[PDB]
Amino acid sequence: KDKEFQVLFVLTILTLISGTIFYSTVEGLRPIDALYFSVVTLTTVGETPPPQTDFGKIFTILYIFIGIGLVFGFIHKLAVNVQLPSILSNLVPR
Amino acid sequence: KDKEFQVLFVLTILTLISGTIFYSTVEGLRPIDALYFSVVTLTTVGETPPPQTDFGKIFTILYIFIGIGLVFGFIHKLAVNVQLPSILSNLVP
Amino acid sequence: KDKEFQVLFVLTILTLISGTIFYSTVEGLRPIDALYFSVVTLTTVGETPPPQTDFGKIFTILYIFIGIGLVFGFIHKLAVNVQLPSILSNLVPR
Amino acid sequence: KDKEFQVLFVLTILTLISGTIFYSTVEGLRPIDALYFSVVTLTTVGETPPPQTDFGKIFTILYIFIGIGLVFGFIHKLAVNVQLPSILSNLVP
Numbered sequence: 020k021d022k023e024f025q026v027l028f029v030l031t032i033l034t035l036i037s038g039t040i041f042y043s044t045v046e047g048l049r050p051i052d053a054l055y056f057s058v059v060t061l062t063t064v065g066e067t068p069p070p071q072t073d074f075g076k077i078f079t080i081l082y083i084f085i086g087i088g089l090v091f092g093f094i095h096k097l098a099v100n101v102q103l104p105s106i107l108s109n110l111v112p113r
Numbered sequence: 114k115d116k117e118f119q120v121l122f123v124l125t126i127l128t129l130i131s132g133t134i135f136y137s138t139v140e141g142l143r144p145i146d147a148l149y150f151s152v153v154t155l156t157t158v159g160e161t162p163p164p165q166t167d168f169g170k171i172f173t174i175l176y177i178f179i180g181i182g183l184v185f186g187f188i189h190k191l192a193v194n195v196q197l198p199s200i201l202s203n204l205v206p
Numbered sequence: 207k208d209k210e211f212q213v214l215f216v217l218t219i220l221t222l223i224s225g226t227i228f229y230s231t232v233e234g235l236r237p238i239d240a241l242y243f244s245v246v247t248l249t250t251v252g253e254t255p256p257p258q259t260d261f262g263k264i265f266t267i268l269y270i271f272i273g274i275g276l277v278f279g280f281i282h283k284l285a286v287n288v289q290l291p292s293i294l295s296n297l298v299p300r
Numbered sequence: 301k302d303k304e305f306q307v308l309f310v311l312t313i314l315t316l317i318s319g320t321i322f323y324s325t326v327e328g329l330r331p332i333d334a335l336y337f338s339v340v341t342l343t344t345v346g347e348t349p350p351p352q353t354d355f356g357k358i359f360t361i362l363y364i365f366i367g368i369g370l371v372f373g374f375i376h377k378l379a380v381n382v383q384l385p386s387i388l389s390n391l392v393p
Contacts, residue, residue: 030387065345066161066347079336088375098183102182200213282369284365
């Protein structure tokens with residue numbers, strides 16, 4: 020698998036579980052929506068409203084600075100170490 | 114050009130067709146809008162509302178993780194291997 | 207100045223003038239707003255509504271793919287070749 | 301740590317204080333909201349409305365160009381020089 024990708028994967032899931040728990044609890048979201056927000060926020064897509072609560076905004080500011088690096092690193096490794104080899108193997112003629 | 118840019122181009126179009134098909138079918142969008150969402154979502158611009166359905170949100174979460182890398186790699190190759198040479202050639206007196 | 211940064215700067219301004227002209231004309235925006243959109247769109251910040259018109263959406267899709275690379279390259283060079291030296295010079299004790 | 305991360309940290313806080321002061325004063329926002337906008341705007345997340353005033357839009361255009369590089373450089377250094385070592389040390393049995 021490659022221990023780095025594996026670890027990046029775990030950390031990213033941990034980061035997303037944490038956001039998911041925080042947003043459903045504090046912003047009153049359904050888990051699906053708290054997870055959805057966490058994800059589109061850390062990947063910087065952002066096509067949702069902002070948080071309503073001041074805790075929500077605060078946590079969110081911290082969550083982005085601490086979380087964006089992990090998330091983008093995971094994507095990088097996924098693309099470089101997972102997807103690129105898959106594509107390679109799939110462009111082989113047999 | 115080069116087979117690499119060409120392939121990256123095809124994959125990106127495939128990824129965008131797939132999103133287009135998914136969003137028009139599941140979120141009920143006109144193809145233009147499903148394509149428009151796919152594109153602004155994978156490039157992370159996101160200037161639209163979120164998906165309405167739970168399938169839509171689920172697929173979208175997966176589509177971002179799997180798709181952002183391809184899309185940004187394609188833009189990278191386009192910039193480096195297509196646009197930069199074009200600008201070079203067209204700065205020559 | 208450094209000819210590369212200079213050229214990147216010009217291209218980015220050209221790209222932004224083009225978007226500014228397109229959006230004020232086709233989406234009916236005030237120039238300030240057409241420029242504002244162009245900018246937050248190419249930098250991927252996106253905190254505006256989408257385009258209304260189908261031409262608008264089409265042009266926008268093409269404008270992002272062709273424009274995001276230039277814009278981010280310009281930012282990179284600005285940060286590396288302009289801002290970093292300024293900061294350096296400004297951390298010198300005299 | 302290292303003087304570099306430290307400096308990048310200070311500059312980012314300075315850039316965010318400046319945006320905070322600007323937006324609360326010119327766009328009439330509570331400091332929490334002016335800080336919140338500054339942050340999601342420079343990190344490019346953007347999940348809020350745009351500025352209302354023309355000064356606000358102008359400043360914001362400039363603030364993105366000048367500020368995005370600092371902010372992303374700081375995140376880079378934080379990830380590379382702070383978070384990676386922390387994770388390393390805490391994977392040791």
